[PDB]
Design a protein around this motif. Structure first.
Motif, PDB file in Angstrom:
ATOM      1  N   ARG A  11       0.983  -0.735  -0.101  1.00 48.28           N
ATOM      2  CA  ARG A  11       0.272   0.286   0.101  1.00 48.28           C
ATOM      3  C   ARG A  11       0.663   1.220   0.152  1.00 48.28           C
ATOM      4  O   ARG A  11       0.247   2.375   0.208  1.00 48.28           O
ATOM      5  CB  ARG A  11      -0.815  -0.068   1.099  1.00 48.28           C
ATOM      6  CG  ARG A  11      -0.059   0.495   2.550  1.00 48.28           C
ATOM      7  CD  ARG A  11      -1.159   0.918   3.897  1.00 48.28           C
ATOM      8  NE  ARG A  11      -1.722  -1.316   4.050  1.00 48.28           N
ATOM      9  CZ  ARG A  11      -2.007  -0.744   5.333  1.00 48.28           C
ATOM     10  NH1 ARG A  11      -2.786  -0.104   5.875  1.00 48.28           N
ATOM     11  NH2 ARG A  11      -2.401  -2.504   5.585  1.00 48.28           N
ATOM     12  N   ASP A  12       2.607   1.002   0.492  1.00 41.23           N
ATOM     13  CA  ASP A  12       3.204   2.219   0.339  1.00 41.23           C
ATOM     14  C   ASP A  12       3.972   2.493  -0.932  1.00 41.23           C
ATOM     15  O   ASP A  12       4.904   3.429  -1.643  1.00 41.23           O
ATOM     16  CB  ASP A  12       3.846   1.869   1.186  1.00 41.23           C
ATOM     17  CG  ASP A  12       3.880   1.681   2.526  1.00 41.23           C
ATOM     18  OD1 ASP A  12       2.973   2.519   3.272  1.00 41.23           O
ATOM     19  OD2 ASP A  12       3.729   1.271   3.542  1.00 41.23           O
ATOM     20  N   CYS A  13       3.180   2.250  -2.080  1.00 38.15           N
ATOM     21  CA  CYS A  13       3.317   2.943  -3.719  1.00 38.15           C
ATOM     22  C   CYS A  13       3.463   5.089  -3.564  1.00 38.15           C
ATOM     23  O   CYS A  13       4.229   5.687  -3.807  1.00 38.15           O
ATOM     24  CB  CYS A  13       2.793   2.460  -4.856  1.00 38.15           C
ATOM     25  SG  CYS A  13       3.405   3.561  -5.720  1.00 38.15           S
ATOM     26  N   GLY A  14       2.636   5.156  -2.354  1.00 39.97           N
ATOM     27  CA  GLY A  14       2.326   7.173  -3.044  1.00 39.97           C
ATOM     28  C   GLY A  14       3.191   6.991  -2.100  1.00 39.97           C
ATOM     29  O   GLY A  14       4.736   8.312  -1.856  1.00 39.97           O
ATOM     30  N   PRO A  15       3.410   7.091  -0.735  1.00 39.81           N
ATOM     31  CA  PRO A  15       4.889   7.052   0.308  1.00 39.81           C
ATOM     32  C   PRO A  15       6.100   7.320  -0.290  1.00 39.81           C
ATOM     33  O   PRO A  15       6.453   7.914   0.330  1.00 39.81           O
ATOM     34  CB  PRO A  15       4.120   6.468   1.836  1.00 39.81           C
ATOM     35  CG  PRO A  15       3.080   6.292   1.911  1.00 39.81           C
ATOM     36  CD  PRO A  15       2.195   6.641   0.211  1.00 39.81           C
ATOM     37  N   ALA A  16       6.286   6.617  -0.747  1.00 37.94           N
ATOM     38  CA  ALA A  16       7.636   5.913  -2.103  1.00 37.94           C
ATOM     39  C   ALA A  16       7.926   6.873  -2.717  1.00 37.94           C
ATOM     40  O   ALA A  16       8.998   7.725  -2.567  1.00 37.94           O
ATOM     41  CB  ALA A  16       7.361   5.048  -1.849  1.00 37.94           C
ATOM     42  N   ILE A  31       9.199   6.184   5.366  1.00 40.10           N
ATOM     43  CA  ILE A  31       7.799   6.034   4.672  1.00 40.10           C
ATOM     44  C   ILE A  31       6.491   5.685   5.561  1.00 40.10           C
ATOM     45  O   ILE A  31       5.750   6.036   5.592  1.00 40.10           O
ATOM     46  CB  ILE A  31       8.259   4.702   3.877  1.00 40.10           C
ATOM     47  CG1 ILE A  31       8.508   4.178   2.891  1.00 40.10           C
ATOM     48  CG2 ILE A  31       6.506   3.602   3.644  1.00 40.10           C
ATOM     49  CD1 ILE A  31       8.887   3.475   2.192  1.00 40.10           C
ATOM     50  N   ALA A  32       6.769   5.107   6.570  1.00 47.08           N
ATOM     51  CA  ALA A  32       6.047   5.134   8.086  1.00 47.08           C
ATOM     52  C   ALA A  32       4.734   6.316   8.278  1.00 47.08           C
ATOM     53  O   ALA A  32       3.852   7.176   7.984  1.00 47.08           O
ATOM     54  CB  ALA A  32       6.449   4.809   9.181  1.00 47.08           C
ATOM     55  N   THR A  40      -2.692   7.164   3.816  1.00 50.23           N
ATOM     56  CA  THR A  40      -2.671   6.334   2.968  1.00 50.23           C
ATOM     57  C   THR A  40      -3.529   5.378   4.107  1.00 50.23           C
ATOM     58  O   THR A  40      -3.383   5.016   4.583  1.00 50.23           O
ATOM     59  CB  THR A  40      -1.189   5.734   2.774  1.00 50.23           C
ATOM     60  OG1 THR A  40      -1.079   6.554   2.761  1.00 50.23           O
ATOM     61  CG2 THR A  40      -0.836   4.337   2.191  1.00 50.23           C
ATOM     62  N   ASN A  41      -4.289   4.363   3.219  1.00 57.16           N
ATOM     63  CA  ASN A  41      -5.262   3.241   3.311  1.00 57.16           C
ATOM     64  C   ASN A  41      -4.376   2.336   3.108  1.00 57.16           C
ATOM     65  O   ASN A  41      -3.455   1.597   2.442  1.00 57.16           O
ATOM     66  CB  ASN A  41      -6.573   3.516   3.853  1.00 57.16           C
ATOM     67  CG  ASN A  41      -6.972   3.362   2.474  1.00 57.16           C
ATOM     68  OD1 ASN A  41      -6.393   3.268   1.302  1.00 57.16           O
ATOM     69  ND2 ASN A  41      -8.136   4.775   1.870  1.00 57.16           N
ATOM     70  N   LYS A  42      -5.254   0.532   3.405  1.00 58.05           N
ATOM     71  CA  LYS A  42      -5.560  -0.327   2.650  1.00 58.05           C
ATOM     72  C   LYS A  42      -5.195  -0.318   1.251  1.00 58.05           C
ATOM     73  O   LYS A  42      -4.478  -1.096   0.459  1.00 58.05           O
ATOM     74  CB  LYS A  42      -6.670  -1.625   2.887  1.00 58.05           C
ATOM     75  CG  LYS A  42      -5.909  -3.148   2.137  1.00 58.05           C
ATOM     76  CD  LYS A  42      -7.502  -3.700   2.662  1.00 58.05           C
ATOM     77  CE  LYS A  42      -7.641  -4.831   1.539  1.00 58.05           C
ATOM     78  NZ  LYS A  42      -6.598  -5.597   2.601  1.00 58.05           N
ATOM     79  N   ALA A  47      -4.157  10.878  -5.241  1.00 54.77           N
ATOM     80  CA  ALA A  47      -3.436  11.826  -5.689  1.00 54.77           C
ATOM     81  C   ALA A  47      -3.396  13.147  -5.153  1.00 54.77           C
ATOM     82  O   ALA A  47      -2.398  13.806  -4.155  1.00 54.77           O
ATOM     83  CB  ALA A  47      -3.952  11.735  -7.207  1.00 54.77           C
ATOM     84  N   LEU A  48      -4.330  12.738  -4.429  1.00 52.98           N
ATOM     85  CA  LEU A  48      -5.009  14.276  -3.599  1.00 52.98           C
ATOM     86  C   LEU A  48      -3.910  13.866  -1.911  1.00 52.98           C
ATOM     87  O   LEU A  48      -4.148  15.208  -1.479  1.00 52.98           O
ATOM     88  CB  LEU A  48      -6.372  14.339  -3.375  1.00 52.98           C
ATOM     89  CG  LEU A  48      -7.314  15.386  -3.839  1.00 52.98           C
ATOM     90  CD1 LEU A  48      -6.434  16.554  -2.174  1.00 52.98           C
ATOM     91  CD2 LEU A  48      -7.073  15.821  -4.203  1.00 52.98           C
ATOM     92  N   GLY A  49      -4.165  12.573  -1.145  1.00 49.33           N
ATOM     93  CA  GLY A  49      -3.318  13.259  -0.561  1.00 49.33           C
ATOM     94  C   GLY A  49      -1.595  12.763  -0.943  1.00 49.33           C
ATOM     95  O   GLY A  49      -1.767  13.404   0.154  1.00 49.33           O
TER      96      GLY A  49
END
Length: 137
Positions: A11-16, A31-32, A40-42, A47-49
């Motif tokens: 689920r971490d592609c965005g944070p990455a 990342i955390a 970020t959720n499950k 894009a907004l996040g």
């Protein structure tokens, strides 16, 4: 030359990708931490996040809908984030570092891919056209 912070949790592609771009500008965020800031959720990050998190980090952000001619513009500022559909993955993103010939240099948080060259044809097939540009304010 191209800094990329890979994901571990699916689920971490965005944070990455956000961590990757931030690292280019000298800032290092875990990342955390970004996962929490981007809500970020499950299902992943919207894009907004990504945009909201970037703004909280002190970055000037803009989200645009573009096409492949974007890469023919010589004044284009790298790196930036793009939304790509990969299989059933509706919330995957890449960092775009540059372009050379008929290929683009991208950063895929997927740890089995990371930084690689991708044909413009392949990229065009996955890209939704959404591009997120960030800049230190």
């Amino acid at each position: 030359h191209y800094k990329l912070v890979p994901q571990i949790d699916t689920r971490d592609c965005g944070p990455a990708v956000l961590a990757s771009v931030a690292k280019h500008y000298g800032s290092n965020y875990s990342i955390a931490y970004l996962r929490e800031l981007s809500k970020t959720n499950k299902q992943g990050t919207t894009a907004l996040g990504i945009v909201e998190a970037a703004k909280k980090l002190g970055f000037e952000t803009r989200s645009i809908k573009a096409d492949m001619t974007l890469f023919d513009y010589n004044d284009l500022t790298y790196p930036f984030i793009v939304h790509v559909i990969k299989g059933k993955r509706l919330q995957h993103y890449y960092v775009v570092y540059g372009s050379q010939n008929n290929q683009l240099i991208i950063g895929d948080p997927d740890p089995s891919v990371k930084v690689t060259r991708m044909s413009k044809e392949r990229f065009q097939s996955e890209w939704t056209g959404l591009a997120i540009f960030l800049a230190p304010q």
